[PDB]
Design a protein around this ligand. Structure first.
Ligand SMILES: CC(C)(O)CC(=O)NCCn1ccc2ncnc(Nc3ccc(Oc4cccc(C(F)(F)F)c4)c(Cl)c3)c21
Length: 305
């Protein structure tokens, strides 16, 4: 394994301005804002998380470990961390993704989402996931809520709170146990707390199904404790109405019990790209052809290098 020479940038608090609240979680408030590096005539749209003073040493430690992961990744389909700021409580500064999480976005805009967008997002997520595999990173929480929308044409994978870097000799990760997203997890993760890139593939399949059903909840009837035996009996999520068998067979392959029988991300890239070239052959959406979707020194983070 190579030396990780990623730079962690520590920002001065006067360098960035909070403009409005985007949301608030358990660990603090997230603000829309602008980052104005001193002496560079540039303004960068950012999201800024200000951790609560209530935050434990334990929580702080785990948040910084997540920032370490985010600072180590550099791909157009993985979230961009700009830096952190070491004030009274720690602040994390990331690229603004103005359209929010992809799960909300498909629920809220389902009447205007065509086959071209759906297939392109599958490609993009596969590209980010492939890159994470190249980095020997196992995500462990892939899901539509954990994909952000920069523009309708460009999504990025986020939330590395569960991510684990594999060791050089290491093949699988073994977790300790706790609050787990059971309905997105490979069977071997539920049963034996084993996680691989192939288990991320399973999660990818569920994420695709979320997208193809415009944000339905997987196994909506069923409680989490029942999931693993349902899977052991060979039952899977149903074929979404818009999906040709071509697309559904792909999701199904992602949910093979034998992890090595699942597709690789680089193959998912290939197969969804083929379909993105003729999208109406692969997803059947009523009115598809009808559909389309959307101070001075402003630059996107992607162009600030
Ligand atoms: C909580 C919540 C507010 O309920 C959910 C939520 O975070 N979503 C906010 C909504 N949101 C909308 C556009 C948008 N664009 C970009 N980043 C967003 N969110 C965002 C997320 C995490 C960020 O930072 C980190 C980095 C690592 C670890 C942690 C952790 F929470 F564990 F402490 C935070 C930042 Cl700076 C922003 C955005």
């Amino acid at each position: 394994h190579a030396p990780n020479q990623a730079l962690l940038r520590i920002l001065k608090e006067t360098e960035f301005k909070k403009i409005k609240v985007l949301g608030s979680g358990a660990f603090g408030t997230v603000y829309k804002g602008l980052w104005i590096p001193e002496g560079e005539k540039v303004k960068i749209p950012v999201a800024i998380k200000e951790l609560r003073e209530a935050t434990s040493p334990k929580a702080n430690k785990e948040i910084l470990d997540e920032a370490y992961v985010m600072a180590s990744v550099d791909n157009p389909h993985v979230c961009r961390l700009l830096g952190i700021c070491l004030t009274s409580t720690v602040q994390l500064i990331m690229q603004l993704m103005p359209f929010g999480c992809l799960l909300d976005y498909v629920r809220e805009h389902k009447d205007n989402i065509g086959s071209q967008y759906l297939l392109n997002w599958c490609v993009q997520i596969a590209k980010g996931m492939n890159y994470l595999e190249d980095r020997r990173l196992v995500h462990r929480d892939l899901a539509a809520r954990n994909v952000l929308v920069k523009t309708p044409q460009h999504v990025k994978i986020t939330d590395f709170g569960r991510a684990k870097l594999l060791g050089a000799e290491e093949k699988e990760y073994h977790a300790e146990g706790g609050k787990v997203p059971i309905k997105w997890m490979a069977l071997e993760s539920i049963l034996h707390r084993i996680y691989t890139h192939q288990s991320d593939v399973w999660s990818y399949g569920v994420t695709v199904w979320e997208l193809m059903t415009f944000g339905s909840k997987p196994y909506d009837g069923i409680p989490a404790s029942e999931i693993s035996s349902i899977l052991e009996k060979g039952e899977r999520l149903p074929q979404p109405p818009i999906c040709t068998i071509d697309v559904y067979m792909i999701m199904v392959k992602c949910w093979m019990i034998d992890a090595d029988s699942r597709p690789k991300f680089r193959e998912l890239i290939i197969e969804f790209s083929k379909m993105a070239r003729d999208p109406q052959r692969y997803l059947v959406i009523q009115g598809d052809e009808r559909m389309h979707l959307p101070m001075d020194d402003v630059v996107d983070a992607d162009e600030y290098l």
